[PDB]
Design a protein around this ligand. Structure first.
Ligand SMILES: [Ca+2]
Ligand SMILES: [Ca+2]
Ligand SMILES: [Ca+2]
Ligand SMILES: [Ca+2]
Ligand SMILES: [Ca+2]
Ligand SMILES: [Ca+2]
Length: 97
């Protein structure tokens, strides 16, 4: 079935870009890659997202893309994150830990 979701990208300079998807995808990674909104690499814990909406995290400055769902922590890699109708996800560029 078709689910209606939003993905908001919070860039390094605080620019927020909001993307709406109408999707039958089971998982968030499929949704993100449907429009090539992210680039990531496979690995043993799932997708490691390096670039979102044409912004690449600088590994050397401890930057990384973080997935949240209505601001709440998401425990799964994007390719293992189930999508529900009405979901709002965020991808935020974070620095450090
Ligand atoms: Ca529906
Ligand atoms: Ca709409
Ligand atoms: Ca891609
Ligand atoms: Ca690519
Ligand atoms: Ca873009
Ligand atoms: Ca519904």
């Amino acid at each position: 079935g078709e689910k209606h979701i939003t993905v908001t990208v919070i860039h390094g300079d605080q620019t927020e870009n909001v993307f709406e998807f109408d999707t039958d995808a089971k998982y968030l990674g499929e949704v993100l890659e449907s429009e090539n909104l992210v680039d990531g690499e496979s690995g043993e814990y799932g997708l490691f997202i390096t670039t979102v909406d044409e912004e690449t995290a600088d590994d050397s400055k401890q930057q990384w893309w973080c997935i949240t769902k209505g601001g709440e922590q998401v425990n799964t890699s994007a390719d293992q994150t189930p999508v529900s109708d009405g979901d709002a996800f965020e991808l935020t560029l974070k620095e450090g830990y």
